[PDB]
Design a protein around this ligand. Sequence first.
Ligand SMILES: Nc1nc2c(ncn2[C@@H]2O[C@H](COP(=O)(O)OP(=O)(O)OP(=O)(O)O)[C@@H](O)[C@H]2O)c(=O)[nH]1
Ligand SMILES: Nc1nc2c(ncn2[C@@H]2O[C@H](COP(=O)(O)OP(=O)(O)OP(=O)(O)O)[C@@H](O)[C@H]2O)c(=O)[nH]1
Ligand SMILES: Nc1nc2c(ncn2[C@@H]2O[C@H](COP(=O)(O)OP(=O)(O)O)[C@@H](O)[C@H]2O)c(=O)[nH]1
Ligand SMILES: Nc1nc2c(ncn2[C@@H]2O[C@H](COP(=O)(O)OP(=O)(O)O)[C@@H](O)[C@H]2O)c(=O)[nH]1
Ligand SMILES: [Mg+2]
Lengths: 39, 432, 432, 91, 428, 428
Amino acid sequence: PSFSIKGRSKLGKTPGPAAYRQTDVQVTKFKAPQYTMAA
Amino acid sequence: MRECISVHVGQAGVQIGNACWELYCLEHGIQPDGQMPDDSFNTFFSETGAGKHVPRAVFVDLEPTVIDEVRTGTYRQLFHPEQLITGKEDAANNYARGHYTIGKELIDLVLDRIRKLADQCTGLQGFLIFHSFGGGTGSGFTSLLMERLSVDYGKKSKLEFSIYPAPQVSTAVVEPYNSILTTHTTLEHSDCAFMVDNEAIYDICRRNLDIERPTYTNLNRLIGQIVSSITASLRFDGALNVDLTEFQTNLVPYPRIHFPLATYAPVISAEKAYHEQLSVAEITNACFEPANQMVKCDPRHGKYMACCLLYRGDVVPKDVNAAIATIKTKRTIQFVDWCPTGFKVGINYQPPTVVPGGDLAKVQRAVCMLSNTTAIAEAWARLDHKFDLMYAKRAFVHWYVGEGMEEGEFSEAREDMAALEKDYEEVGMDSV
Amino acid sequence: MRECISVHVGQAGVQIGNACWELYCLEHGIQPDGQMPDDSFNTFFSETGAGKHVPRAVFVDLEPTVIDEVRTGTYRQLFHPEQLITGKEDAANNYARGHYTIGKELIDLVLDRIRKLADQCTGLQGFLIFHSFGGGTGSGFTSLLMERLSVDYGKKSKLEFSIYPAPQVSTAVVEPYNSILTTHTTLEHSDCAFMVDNEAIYDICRRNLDIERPTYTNLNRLIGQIVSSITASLRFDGALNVDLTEFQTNLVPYPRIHFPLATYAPVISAEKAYHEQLSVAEITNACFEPANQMVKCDPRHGKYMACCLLYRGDVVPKDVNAAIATIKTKRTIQFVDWCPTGFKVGINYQPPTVVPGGDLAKVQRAVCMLSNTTAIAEAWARLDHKFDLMYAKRAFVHWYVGEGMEEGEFSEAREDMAALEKDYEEVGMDSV
Amino acid sequence: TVSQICPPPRRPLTVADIRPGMENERLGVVRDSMFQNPLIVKAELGKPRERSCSLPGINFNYGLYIRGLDGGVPEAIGHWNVFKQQPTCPH
Amino acid sequence: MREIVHLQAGQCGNQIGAKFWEVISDEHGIDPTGTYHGDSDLQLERINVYYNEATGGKYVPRAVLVDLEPGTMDSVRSGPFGQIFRPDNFVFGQSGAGNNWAKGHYTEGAELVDSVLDVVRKEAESCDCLQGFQLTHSLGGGTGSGMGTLLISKIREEYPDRIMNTFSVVPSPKVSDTVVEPYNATLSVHQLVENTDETYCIDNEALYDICFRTLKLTTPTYGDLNHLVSATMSGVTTCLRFPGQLNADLRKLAVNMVPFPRLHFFMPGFAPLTSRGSQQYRALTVPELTQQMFDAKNMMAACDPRHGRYLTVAAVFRGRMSMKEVDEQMLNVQNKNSSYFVEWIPNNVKTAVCDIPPRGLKMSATFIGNSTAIQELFKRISEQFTAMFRRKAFLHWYTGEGMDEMEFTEAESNMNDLVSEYQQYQDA
Amino acid sequence: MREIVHLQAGQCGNQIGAKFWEVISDEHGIDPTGTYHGDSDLQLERINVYYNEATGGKYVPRAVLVDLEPGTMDSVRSGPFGQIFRPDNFVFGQSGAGNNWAKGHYTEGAELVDSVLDVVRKEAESCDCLQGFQLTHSLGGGTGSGMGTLLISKIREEYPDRIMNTFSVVPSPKVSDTVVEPYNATLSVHQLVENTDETYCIDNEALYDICFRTLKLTTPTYGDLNHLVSATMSGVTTCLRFPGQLNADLRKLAVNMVPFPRLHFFMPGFAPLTSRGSQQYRALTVPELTQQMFDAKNMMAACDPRHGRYLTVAAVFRGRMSMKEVDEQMLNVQNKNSSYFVEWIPNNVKTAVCDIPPRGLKMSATFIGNSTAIQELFKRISEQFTAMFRRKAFLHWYTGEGMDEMEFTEAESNMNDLVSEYQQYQDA
Ligand SMILES: Nc1nc2c(ncn2[C@@H]2O[C@H](COP(=O)(O)OP(=O)(O)OP(=O)(O)O)[C@@H](O)[C@H]2O)c(=O)[nH]1
Ligand SMILES: Nc1nc2c(ncn2[C@@H]2O[C@H](COP(=O)(O)OP(=O)(O)OP(=O)(O)O)[C@@H](O)[C@H]2O)c(=O)[nH]1
Ligand SMILES: Nc1nc2c(ncn2[C@@H]2O[C@H](COP(=O)(O)OP(=O)(O)O)[C@@H](O)[C@H]2O)c(=O)[nH]1
Ligand SMILES: Nc1nc2c(ncn2[C@@H]2O[C@H](COP(=O)(O)OP(=O)(O)O)[C@@H](O)[C@H]2O)c(=O)[nH]1
Ligand SMILES: [Mg+2]
């Protein structure tokens, strides 16, 4: 039988954990009120 | 190993979504609450722990009710408590209100969920977005959404399901505007926007399905069955299965021109067939009958370019060719002189499922036909001319221009609209 | 054999101390009574004659209330009756008070017992401070402790877990004074000063732990899991265990540049963890995101230097090593050109024990990231800029000089901050 | 859910679990439903949101932990077992 | 001593390859497990041709299963003989194919090609003596056309003297199940015309027609359709394994068939195909087995051999027959249908007779011919190409990877050259 | 007889070595306790080679365990094989071996070497012809590299003639467990191209590949990886504990496998490395183990064996084969891939056939090949150094335990020297 050495095949998406500047609570969740003075 | 993130956006979408996810859950075998009492589920679901099959979706709505009801319903214990991103103020039928104003605030929380849903995926063959050419949430957001995803995720085929403005019936006064702008940000950032119009769905379920007074519910189940069919090959088994990447190379016939139609044909009234069962031969003809077209556009006034016929059920490999033959001979059905072929068969095995309490029978066959006929040219030409009437006397522009959209944009959109016109006209003029 | 001396100082550190010792007790089999109903308690629980496990700590604050709370509360039969070092006045949000007055009338009383702690068992790996940068005992008393213990003991590594001022969130009007006044005597004797913010965890407890009403007790349990993880690799068996004198050798490149970050990855509640499969792939992909950094600081602006990924629980080492190769090929976590490496790994065999009746889901996995990035310089300019608005006329200075203070250190601390700002800056640029 | 570890599952809050003192001691009618949907549900002092659903017990293991049919290297190296020609019954 | 391997490439060829190892393994007695449960001894004496012996007596089929989608070998593994193959040559790419000859040959193709050539060689070196290979592909789409023609390219320089046998379902004229099928065949048959000596061109129209006019079966699926294909697949290489009278391997067929190097497109046929309802009067005489071969209804390609002369006939007869009666009927077909046979070649048939018939059927033959009328197939698909290419319909999705208009105007020119030189000899 | 001293210094080596002791205990039938529970006399005849003896027969392992942290001590102690080890040989030192090259080579580390060499001596003396030194270590850490290059230096001076058979896990690209490995590596290679003759370079980036693409596992732990290493460890000494047609000792594995004096860094490998799934579809023949010995996916180190004309290779075949095959199958491989083998060395292969096969695999082999490919492994750590040096990186903890910029420049110089040496012949 002939035989020969082989190996190291090349074989064997998601953009980033980071980027995507992440926003705050006053967006999709409850907003604590604003409380102006009295005049 | 095959995955498809589903971004249900806007009321329309979230609605078509709760109809599609029921159809999906049943087909696979999970009770509306996860917990299945196999690789099928994978395409549209992901297991996580002691039987908590959760879906691959991300419900998005700038308004907080259509998703609130999805959060306090029966499928509440299914969708991740974080995938159903709601919001605050609505989008007042304003492309600007979504794309430029309100919308620009949730885009982050939607694309980060999309990010997570895809790092857990191992083969995103294509996204499935569900929008409506009616208002901002469905138009503006889906635009921003597309643009970002287009570059952020990449060549992954983003296929979308859209509800086009009907040529007479409508629930808006500004729909001509909203829709035209959506195209300017879709004709270049999508691959196949399987369209549909309620007016025709309200006739399929009025001439065939003997059902008067149909509500939204009984108009999205049929949309669910079309989408279920185009995603059944990459979910169960088959003989000539078509991957999501082939519903493109074998349909879109030029750079743009990427808007397929739809025609599930064995739509049969519940109380009807007691001594009959449709056979491929006629089930095919049914989808081509100019009365099952779920998108209103005299299919005869044009030239069917390409055609994909997905057969689900006991469809035999050689009888689909019999059907294809006769159809090709039928004079009326005119196929362009450029495409000598013109069909793509998909014999899957799983028979169309039965929503427990709907309007569909248990037919052992199906023919979801996604067709690209020039006819749609006119089907959007109507909307275009409706735009003309309003814009002429700057009407309802005050509202959009006052949310961050240069009035110029409107005109530029009509330029891209009138482009797809000559394009559809051009992709027909018989070769000299 | 293994040891870590945990010194709890200030209002904040005592509060963290109440909660962090809950974790250490509940990991082992010591009920809060003190008696145990093998060799893993020898790092945080000094054994006695009867079977009691008196903890290795010292509790000190000038304020009587916080220690008397421990001297009246439930954790009271286990604490040494004298290690509860109680002062008799208050540090008064004042660097002057704690470092050059009533602070130096409690030193010999706290330095006797902390000296009495070293001589009763062997193997002192390092030193654990718990304080805050805010205004008083955590700046005045903390300073005089860790400068004096750096000559009396010798060389063993000195770790602190401070509560840095948020660039918004603040419960005192002179924090920037008493934070730049505790960086001259931090930068020269603290090997790794693990700062933890307040604003971030408020946000982390809201998005992921899903608390829209968080109290201080919840803020300290999450930090309690952070300090448990670094001290679990010397307490429990593993596969790539790190030691308290070697993660110094791989996290601080330059002698001045030493301030790390911190992130617990399974930081999520019960109604989301049944919905999510906390596998190795995204449990390392949740440390790197800008929504789980326990210090409010932009992690993208500023390129990463070294990442000591403390894994915990059941993780298969290949799944780790392949997931690490992912975080390198993605293009937003910029790593330094001066090290192509930068990823220290380590796996323990003990799963996280969440305190029962607690917010955190009980997960048999954890990734306690200990980051070190060139971004915290931008989180130092914010407190530096606060100095440049209250020193322009020298407000709130008469309490400082009034007890006793030179005005010299105020300008001298700024050029120390100017040194620390410029130090975390030259290590970003390329040398051609 | 219930079969997920034999200790009782984490029941959502009901009428009988309301004590005097907390902010959720709700004035008006107290039935089992308003504490099971979140927009009537308010927040308490440092607790999760009212789970609104049947969650498993405290000791339940969350997430998938794969236990593959394995044994690994001292199975692939430690033993060479070829396909056994099973003797069929004499038909 | 003698070897041939098989290369299942494409959804077609893998399922045809499923039929390959259930008509061969039953022809010489191997079970679904792999154990030999047979009766005759002269079927393990040449097992080394298609099989590799293992420890204990299990025989493994030397065959790779090439694709660019895991779905089609999940099907063939779950099939009745899906345990017989090595689980190491079940090589699969994970990204899809999209029926693109372009994407399955230049971009998503060039990830599996080193991996398949690693497992092609590991069997093909492990021989005593090679004669050639076998690759069942589509010629009508993605994985079959694209990857398949890359294999026959890279496998050619690596063994430059072996009988490279490729099987292909040519896209039928009326039957069309792929809209891009003239954009797949024309570019693929471009490469087929140089690095392939034996290629048996089959279709799907005539395979249906044999099932509706000869077998009388009113439900031909894709299972029984490929059994007729697998009948030829055996028959041309039954003379390799099974002993008998006047012999002919593959190099023989070639030398005694391909006249000029380009002109090597062949047409198969199974001779004793009878309707299933037949039970009585069982005497398959040789004078009626010669009529069901040279008729244009058992032709397994779309083109008919009436609209052009032949070039060379190969008939691998099987069973026990008196070759006087065999030869005299090879004469009469030449003499009776004299116009539909070459005059510049004196004798236009090859005869090959085995001794072992197929299982069941006492007498059989395999018709291999090359009529000059297959240029009708090559001209019609050129007409199917000159209407698409002229104003560039699907090209915007084939030029996206980097194959510009240069490769299409040259392939059509080579297509017209394949039409022209194939026809200039019909004039004679 | 010929004895081999075994030192276990480091965090990685400690476990690789303990794992080795099980894959050497089973062969000589030593139960975890210490009594012999085997079945043949062909194992007790050399129970005096890797094992010693004891009143009764508690053949205790001649090992010397060392680590400046009593962690692995109890870890190993409380393991599959612990009791057997000598309580006295557990020389440890409650300290902090902080991953730092200047930890166990200059500071704390050096304050134990004395007690270490004290044990090493006790054994070395109580024995006949000593042969070599078996240190299981890691060329990327504190003890592993620092204390390693110390114990080996202070042993090649006390025992010159005796060879030095170390086993190190060289750093790599993908797998990265420490941050200051580049340093710990370069610094160690310095005192390894000057005081060793048998350095078996193993990696974790290709070993994991073997355990994912060959033994297809789903949970490759740390025990799995070490077991593959342990195999080759108990394979290069098989011709010193068991009979064999053609034997080859560790000096024969030196005069033959070390071409020029400096080129002594070799890569390891095992033969029967197939998964259970296919361990029934493939036979285990001398003409088969050779491809599972000459394949990059069966080498436990990285460095594509292709990019580098292999200098000298050796295969300790085990079991009962026929040298007629061994000789020819080796010969074939050689001339078949002559381009990738070297020319200035006419023959480039050494065949060593034992008679005792590894528990199970009736025919096994260990591939130790010196190739001009290990240069890449020694160039990746060099570029790593450059970066973490141009801008003096974590040197503030090295140049603080008694180090000097000079040392680093020296190490890197001597490091790049070996690259040039493994290239000045490659070009030929
Ligand atoms: N098929 C189908 N179409 C729907 C359904 N609900 C709404 N639509 C379509 O959507 C149009 C109404 O506008 P939408 O797009 O739903 O409004 P929106 O998505 O909330 O966007 P905004 O109005 O800007 O907030 C109608 O003309 C319908 O054609 C539904 O349940 N099924
Ligand atoms: N996370 C957390 N932070 C706390 C807690 N208690 C106090 N803090 C922090 O501590 C700050 C309050 O000032 P401290 O630094 O604690 O006061 P002090 O140093 O003890 O000085 P005196 O009160 O005068 O003795 C706040 O800004 C908080 O950020 C707590 O329980 N959890
Ligand atoms: N005989 C046979 N022909 C098939 C089979 N499947 C598909 N075909 C033919 O192949 C053509 C389509 O090629 P296709 O399978 O989509 O290409 P591929 O998926 O890239 O290999 C159709 O015209 C069918 O007639 C099969 O199982 N058997
Ligand atoms: N392959 C393998 N490598 C290991 C194992 N245990 C540790 N290592 C390696 O050892 C290296 C760290 O060495 P280090 O702990 O600094 O050596 P030390 O001086 O003894 O502390 C890491 O790169 C690991 O890859 C194991 O079980 N298998
Ligand atoms: Mg205080």
